[PDB]
Motif scaffolding. Structure first.
Motif, PDB file in Angstrom:
ATOM      1  N   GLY A 111       0.928  -1.081   0.088  1.00 54.11           N
ATOM      2  CA  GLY A 111      -0.359  -0.099  -0.206  1.00 54.11           C
ATOM      3  C   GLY A 111       0.858   1.162  -0.205  1.00 54.11           C
ATOM      4  N   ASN A 112       2.318   0.835  -0.679  1.00 56.83           N
ATOM      5  CA  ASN A 112       3.348   2.642  -0.939  1.00 56.83           C
ATOM      6  C   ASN A 112       2.477   2.661  -2.306  1.00 56.83           C
ATOM      7  N   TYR A 113       3.228   3.666  -2.651  1.00 50.66           N
ATOM      8  CA  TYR A 113       2.196   4.256  -3.736  1.00 50.66           C
ATOM      9  C   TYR A 113       3.904   4.563  -4.650  1.00 50.66           C
ATOM     10  N   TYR A 114       4.039   4.241  -5.451  1.00 52.80           N
ATOM     11  CA  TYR A 114       5.008   4.416  -6.811  1.00 52.80           C
ATOM     12  C   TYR A 114       5.009   5.441  -7.750  1.00 52.80           C
ATOM     13  N   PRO A 115       6.161   6.685  -7.871  1.00 53.73           N
ATOM     14  CA  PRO A 115       5.814   6.999  -8.890  1.00 53.73           C
ATOM     15  C   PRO A 115       6.272   6.869 -10.303  1.00 53.73           C
ATOM     16  N   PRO A 116       5.899   7.075 -11.759  1.00 59.64           N
ATOM     17  CA  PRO A 116       6.398   6.413 -12.996  1.00 59.64           C
ATOM     18  C   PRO A 116       7.673   6.376 -12.719  1.00 59.64           C
ATOM     19  N   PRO A 117       9.731   6.945 -12.482  1.00 52.65           N
ATOM     20  CA  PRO A 117      10.639   6.695 -12.771  1.00 52.65           C
ATOM     21  C   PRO A 117      10.723   5.431 -11.604  1.00 52.65           C
ATOM     22  N   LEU A 118      10.187   5.664 -10.306  1.00 58.46           N
ATOM     23  CA  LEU A 118      10.749   4.849  -9.081  1.00 58.46           C
ATOM     24  C   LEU A 118       9.725   3.453  -9.353  1.00 58.46           C
ATOM     25  N   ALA A 119       8.422   3.576  -9.901  1.00 59.68           N
ATOM     26  CA  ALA A 119       7.843   2.685  -9.902  1.00 59.68           C
ATOM     27  C   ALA A 119       8.927   1.374 -11.367  1.00 59.68           C
ATOM     28  N   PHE A 120       9.243   2.361 -12.842  1.00 59.55           N
ATOM     29  CA  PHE A 120       9.700   1.741 -13.267  1.00 59.55           C
ATOM     30  C   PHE A 120      11.570   0.763 -12.365  1.00 59.55           C
ATOM     31  N   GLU A 121      12.023   1.887 -12.254  1.00 56.01           N
ATOM     32  CA  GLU A 121      13.990   1.928 -11.702  1.00 56.01           C
ATOM     33  C   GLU A 121      13.244   0.429 -10.515  1.00 56.01           C
ATOM     34  N   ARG A 122      12.237   0.083  -9.839  1.00 58.59           N
ATOM     35  CA  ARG A 122      12.302  -1.018  -8.682  1.00 58.59           C
ATOM     36  C   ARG A 122      12.157  -1.634  -9.862  1.00 58.59           C
ATOM     37  N   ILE A 123      11.739  -2.198 -10.557  1.00 54.91           N
ATOM     38  CA  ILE A 123      12.458  -3.798 -11.801  1.00 54.91           C
ATOM     39  C   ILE A 123      13.616  -3.659 -10.896  1.00 54.91           C
ATOM     40  N   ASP A 124      13.965  -4.823 -10.630  1.00 58.34           N
ATOM     41  CA  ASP A 124      15.715  -5.007 -10.764  1.00 58.34           C
ATOM     42  C   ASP A 124      16.995  -5.543 -12.201  1.00 58.34           C
ATOM     43  N   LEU A 125      18.133  -4.657 -12.705  1.00 52.19           N
ATOM     44  CA  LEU A 125      19.193  -5.786 -12.581  1.00 52.19           C
ATOM     45  C   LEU A 125      19.183  -7.157 -12.323  1.00 52.19           C
ATOM     46  N   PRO A 126      20.293  -8.600 -12.832  1.00 53.53           N
ATOM     47  CA  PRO A 126      21.265  -9.700 -12.499  1.00 53.53           C
ATOM     48  C   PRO A 126      23.025  -8.573 -12.428  1.00 53.53           C
ATOM     49  N   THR A 184       2.277   4.979 -20.803  1.00 53.99           N
ATOM     50  CA  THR A 184       2.865   4.354 -20.365  1.00 53.99           C
ATOM     51  C   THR A 184       4.693   4.920 -19.952  1.00 53.99           C
ATOM     52  N   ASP A 185       4.526   6.770 -19.872  1.00 57.83           N
ATOM     53  CA  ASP A 185       5.629   7.732 -19.677  1.00 57.83           C
ATOM     54  C   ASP A 185       6.259   6.982 -18.742  1.00 57.83           C
ATOM     55  N   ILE A 186       7.582   7.347 -18.726  1.00 55.51           N
ATOM     56  CA  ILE A 186       8.373   7.365 -17.413  1.00 55.51           C
ATOM     57  C   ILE A 186       8.834   7.962 -16.847  1.00 55.51           C
ATOM     58  N   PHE A 187       9.872   8.516 -17.809  1.00 57.46           N
ATOM     59  CA  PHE A 187       9.959  10.223 -16.460  1.00 57.46           C
ATOM     60  C   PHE A 187      10.732   9.971 -16.392  1.00 57.46           C
ATOM     61  N   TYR A 188      11.799   9.285 -16.605  1.00 60.60           N
ATOM     62  CA  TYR A 188      12.983   9.470 -16.089  1.00 60.60           C
ATOM     63  C   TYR A 188      14.201  10.013 -16.842  1.00 60.60           C
ATOM     64  N   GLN A 189      13.758  11.310 -17.696  1.00 59.21           N
ATOM     65  CA  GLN A 189      15.019  12.112 -18.609  1.00 59.21           C
ATOM     66  C   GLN A 189      15.293  12.737 -17.679  1.00 59.21           C
ATOM     67  N   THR A 190      16.564  13.003 -17.126  1.00 58.44           N
ATOM     68  CA  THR A 190      17.319  13.994 -16.313  1.00 58.44           C
ATOM     69  C   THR A 190      17.435  15.818 -16.412  1.00 58.44           C
ATOM     70  N   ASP A 191      17.325  16.570 -16.093  1.00 58.47           N
ATOM     71  CA  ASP A 191      17.021  17.766 -15.900  1.00 58.47           C
ATOM     72  C   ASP A 191      18.992  17.954 -16.367  1.00 58.47           C
ATOM     73  N   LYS A 192      19.168  18.464 -17.629  1.00 56.48           N
ATOM     74  CA  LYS A 192      20.455  18.447 -18.394  1.00 56.48           C
ATOM     75  C   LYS A 192      21.006  19.499 -17.768  1.00 56.48           C
ATOM     76  N   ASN A 193      20.630  20.248 -17.573  1.00 53.29           N
ATOM     77  CA  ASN A 193      21.087  21.687 -16.840  1.00 53.29           C
ATOM     78  C   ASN A 193      22.260  21.530 -15.408  1.00 53.29           C
ATOM     79  N   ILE A 194      21.330  20.665 -14.949  1.00 49.48           N
ATOM     80  CA  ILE A 194      22.490  20.131 -13.389  1.00 49.48           C
ATOM     81  C   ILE A 194      23.345  19.242 -13.599  1.00 49.48           C
TER      82      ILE A 194
END
Length: 224
Positions: free
Chosen positions: A46-61, A98-108
Protein backbone atom coordinates in the motif's frame (compact mmCIF):
# COMPACT_ATOMS: atom_id res chain seq x y z
CA UNK A 1 -6.98 -6.76 -9.23
CA UNK A 2 -7.27 -4.06 -6.54
CA UNK A 3 -9.63 -1.14 -7.20
CA UNK A 4 -6.97 1.30 -5.83
CA UNK A 5 -3.87 -0.18 -7.63
CA UNK A 6 -3.29 3.31 -9.12
CA UNK A 7 -4.12 6.95 -8.39
CA UNK A 8 -4.01 9.72 -11.08
CA UNK A 9 -2.69 13.07 -9.68
CA UNK A 10 -3.11 16.50 -11.28
CA UNK A 11 -1.90 20.10 -10.56
CA UNK A 12 -4.77 22.57 -9.97
CA UNK A 13 -2.83 25.64 -8.50
CA UNK A 14 0.40 27.00 -7.03
CA UNK A 15 1.26 24.11 -4.69
CA UNK A 16 -2.28 22.70 -5.16
CA UNK A 17 -3.19 19.07 -6.40
CA UNK A 18 -6.12 16.75 -6.90
CA UNK A 19 -6.11 12.84 -7.24
CA UNK A 20 -8.52 10.24 -8.50
CA UNK A 21 -8.27 6.53 -7.69
CA UNK A 22 -8.55 4.10 -10.58
CA UNK A 23 -12.07 2.82 -9.40
CA UNK A 24 -13.48 6.45 -9.16
CA UNK A 25 -12.58 7.52 -12.66
CA UNK A 26 -15.77 8.59 -14.56
CA UNK A 27 -14.20 7.84 -17.95
CA UNK A 28 -11.48 5.88 -19.61
CA UNK A 29 -8.48 8.25 -19.63
CA UNK A 30 -6.71 8.74 -22.99
CA UNK A 31 -3.03 8.16 -23.39
CA UNK A 32 -2.53 11.93 -23.15
CA UNK A 33 -4.33 12.17 -19.83
CA UNK A 34 -2.32 9.13 -18.50
CA UNK A 35 0.91 10.83 -19.69
CA UNK A 36 0.12 14.31 -18.24
CA UNK A 37 -0.79 13.04 -14.78
CA UNK A 38 1.47 12.01 -11.96
CA UNK A 39 0.57 8.19 -11.93
CA UNK A 40 0.91 6.51 -8.51
CA UNK A 41 1.20 2.61 -8.46
CA UNK A 42 0.23 0.72 -5.24
CA UNK A 43 2.99 -1.90 -4.24
CA UNK A 44 2.38 -5.02 -2.12
CA UNK A 45 1.93 -3.11 1.23
CA UNK A 46 0.00 0.00 0.00
CA UNK A 47 3.01 2.29 -0.68
CA UNK A 48 2.48 4.33 -3.85
CA UNK A 49 5.30 4.79 -6.48
CA UNK A 50 5.44 7.44 -9.19
CA UNK A 51 6.53 6.27 -12.64
CA UNK A 52 10.41 6.68 -12.89
CA UNK A 53 10.58 4.90 -9.41
CA UNK A 54 8.03 2.19 -10.11
CA UNK A 55 10.05 1.50 -13.27
CA UNK A 56 13.57 1.59 -11.66
CA UNK A 57 11.94 -0.65 -8.72
CA UNK A 58 12.14 -3.50 -11.34
CA UNK A 59 15.97 -4.84 -10.64
CA UNK A 60 18.97 -5.96 -13.04
CA UNK A 61 21.21 -9.54 -12.57
CA UNK A 62 25.26 -9.00 -10.89
CA UNK A 63 27.31 -10.89 -13.79
CA UNK A 64 25.08 -8.46 -16.50
CA UNK A 65 26.02 -4.75 -14.60
CA UNK A 66 30.49 -5.65 -14.19
CA UNK A 67 30.71 -6.87 -17.91
CA UNK A 68 29.48 -2.78 -19.12
CA UNK A 69 33.05 -0.12 -19.72
CA UNK A 70 31.28 2.65 -22.46
CA UNK A 71 29.16 5.71 -21.61
CA UNK A 72 25.05 6.99 -23.16
CA UNK A 73 24.71 3.03 -24.71
CA UNK A 74 24.99 2.39 -20.93
CA UNK A 75 21.27 4.19 -20.64
CA UNK A 76 19.66 2.28 -23.82
CA UNK A 77 20.48 -1.77 -22.42
CA UNK A 78 19.21 -1.32 -18.84
CA UNK A 79 15.92 0.21 -20.30
CA UNK A 80 14.98 -2.74 -22.71
CA UNK A 81 15.36 -5.23 -19.82
CA UNK A 82 12.93 -3.26 -17.40
CA UNK A 83 10.57 -2.04 -20.48
CA UNK A 84 9.31 -5.70 -20.81
CA UNK A 85 8.43 -6.04 -17.24
CA UNK A 86 6.91 -2.53 -17.22
CA UNK A 87 4.81 -2.97 -20.48
CA UNK A 88 3.42 -6.28 -19.21
CA UNK A 89 2.18 -4.60 -16.05
CA UNK A 90 0.62 -1.57 -17.86
CA UNK A 91 -1.23 -3.89 -20.21
CA UNK A 92 -2.79 -5.75 -17.29
CA UNK A 93 -3.79 -2.47 -15.47
CA UNK A 94 -5.32 -1.00 -18.68
CA UNK A 95 -3.07 2.05 -18.73
CA UNK A 96 -2.24 3.33 -22.25
CA UNK A 97 0.02 6.23 -21.35
CA UNK A 98 3.13 4.37 -20.22
CA UNK A 99 5.78 7.22 -20.21
CA UNK A 100 8.41 6.61 -17.51
CA UNK A 101 9.68 10.19 -17.10
CA UNK A 102 13.20 9.15 -16.27
CA UNK A 103 14.76 11.93 -18.28
CA UNK A 104 17.15 14.02 -16.13
CA UNK A 105 17.42 17.77 -16.13
CA UNK A 106 20.57 18.26 -18.22
CA UNK A 107 21.57 21.74 -16.86
CA UNK A 108 22.32 19.96 -13.51
CA UNK A 109 25.85 18.18 -12.88
CA UNK A 110 26.44 15.53 -10.19
CA UNK A 111 29.21 15.45 -7.45
CA UNK A 112 31.92 12.51 -7.45
CA UNK A 113 29.69 10.18 -5.30
CA UNK A 114 27.25 10.40 -8.34
CA UNK A 115 24.76 12.50 -6.25
CA UNK A 116 23.11 15.97 -6.29
CA UNK A 117 25.11 18.94 -4.89
CA UNK A 118 23.30 20.40 -1.82
CA UNK A 119 22.36 23.54 -3.80
CA UNK A 120 20.45 21.37 -6.35
CA UNK A 121 18.42 19.09 -4.01
CA UNK A 122 15.51 21.42 -2.91
CA UNK A 123 12.03 22.36 -4.26
CA UNK A 124 10.59 25.68 -2.99
CA UNK A 125 6.90 25.87 -2.23
CA UNK A 126 5.28 29.34 -2.27
CA UNK A 127 3.84 29.15 1.30
CA UNK A 128 5.19 25.95 2.93
CA UNK A 129 9.02 26.12 2.99
CA UNK A 130 11.49 23.96 0.95
CA UNK A 131 11.48 20.23 0.47
CA UNK A 132 14.49 17.96 -0.15
CA UNK A 133 14.39 15.58 -3.22
CA UNK A 134 16.50 12.61 -4.42
CA UNK A 135 16.86 13.39 -8.22
CA UNK A 136 16.30 16.20 -10.80
CA UNK A 137 13.87 15.23 -13.51
CA UNK A 138 13.20 17.03 -16.80
CA UNK A 139 9.33 16.43 -16.18
CA UNK A 140 9.19 17.18 -12.50
CA UNK A 141 5.34 16.82 -11.97
CA UNK A 142 4.95 13.50 -13.84
CA UNK A 143 8.05 12.10 -12.21
CA UNK A 144 6.47 12.53 -8.73
CA UNK A 145 9.01 15.14 -7.69
CA UNK A 146 6.36 17.79 -6.86
CA UNK A 147 3.73 16.16 -4.62
CA UNK A 148 2.59 17.20 -1.14
CA UNK A 149 3.81 15.66 2.08
CA UNK A 150 0.55 13.81 2.98
CA UNK A 151 -1.94 11.75 0.94
CA UNK A 152 -5.20 10.65 2.66
CA UNK A 153 -7.23 7.98 0.89
CA UNK A 154 -10.74 7.62 2.45
CA UNK A 155 -12.78 4.35 2.64
CA UNK A 156 -14.58 5.60 -0.55
CA UNK A 157 -11.08 5.89 -2.30
CA UNK A 158 -11.29 9.67 -2.42
CA UNK A 159 -7.91 11.43 -2.18
CA UNK A 160 -7.08 14.46 -0.02
CA UNK A 161 -3.65 16.12 -0.03
CA UNK A 162 -1.92 18.15 2.57
CA UNK A 163 1.36 20.17 3.29
CA UNK A 164 2.85 20.65 6.79
CA UNK A 165 4.47 24.03 7.70
CA UNK A 166 6.53 25.34 10.68
CA UNK A 167 3.93 26.34 13.28
CA UNK A 168 0.80 24.82 11.67
CA UNK A 169 -2.35 23.50 13.47
CA UNK A 170 -0.25 20.37 14.44
CA UNK A 171 3.01 22.11 15.53
CA UNK A 172 4.71 19.90 18.19
CA UNK A 173 1.67 17.52 17.97
CA UNK A 174 2.24 13.76 17.36
CA UNK A 175 1.46 11.89 14.15
CA UNK A 176 -0.97 9.63 16.17
CA UNK A 177 -3.12 12.69 17.01
CA UNK A 178 -3.31 13.72 13.33
CA UNK A 179 -4.11 10.11 12.55
CA UNK A 180 -7.03 10.01 15.08
CA UNK A 181 -8.58 13.25 13.74
CA UNK A 182 -8.30 11.83 10.24
CA UNK A 183 -10.12 8.66 11.08
CA UNK A 184 -12.78 10.54 13.07
CA UNK A 185 -13.46 12.78 9.98
CA UNK A 186 -13.27 10.05 7.26
CA UNK A 187 -13.75 6.60 8.74
CA UNK A 188 -11.40 4.33 10.63
CA UNK A 189 -10.51 2.39 7.38
CA UNK A 190 -8.82 5.55 5.95
CA UNK A 191 -5.18 5.18 4.63
CA UNK A 192 -2.52 7.83 5.22
CA UNK A 193 0.62 8.08 3.05
CA UNK A 194 3.64 10.11 3.97
CA UNK A 195 5.97 11.19 1.18
CA UNK A 196 9.57 10.15 0.92
CA UNK A 197 12.26 12.43 -0.56
CA UNK A 198 12.13 10.19 -3.60
CA UNK A 199 8.55 10.78 -4.36
CA UNK A 200 7.32 7.50 -2.86
CA UNK A 201 4.24 7.78 -0.66
CA UNK A 202 4.73 5.25 2.08
CA UNK A 203 1.73 3.98 3.97
CA UNK A 204 1.88 5.11 7.61
CA UNK A 205 1.35 1.53 8.99
CA UNK A 206 4.09 0.15 6.70
CA UNK A 207 6.47 2.76 8.22
CA UNK A 208 5.44 1.83 11.81
CA UNK A 209 5.88 -1.94 11.11
CA UNK A 210 9.44 -1.05 9.91
CA UNK A 211 10.27 0.97 13.11
CA UNK A 212 7.76 2.14 15.73
CA UNK A 213 7.60 5.98 15.63
CA UNK A 214 8.93 6.28 11.98
CA UNK A 215 5.56 7.64 10.79
CA UNK A 216 5.86 10.36 13.48
CA UNK A 217 9.51 11.08 12.58
CA UNK A 218 8.59 11.58 8.93
CA UNK A 219 5.49 13.66 9.89
CA UNK A 220 7.52 16.03 12.22
CA UNK A 221 10.30 16.47 9.63
CA UNK A 222 7.93 18.00 7.04
CA UNK A 223 7.36 20.90 9.58
CA UNK A 224 11.14 21.18 10.51
Amino acid sequence: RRTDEYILVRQTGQDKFAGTTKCNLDHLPTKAEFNASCRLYRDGVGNYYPPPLAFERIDLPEQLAAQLLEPREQSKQCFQYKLEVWNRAHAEMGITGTDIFYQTDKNIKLDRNYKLRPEDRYIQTEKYGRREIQKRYEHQFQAGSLLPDILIKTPQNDIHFSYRFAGDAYANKRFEEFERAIKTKYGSDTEIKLKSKSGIMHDSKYLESWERGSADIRFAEFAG
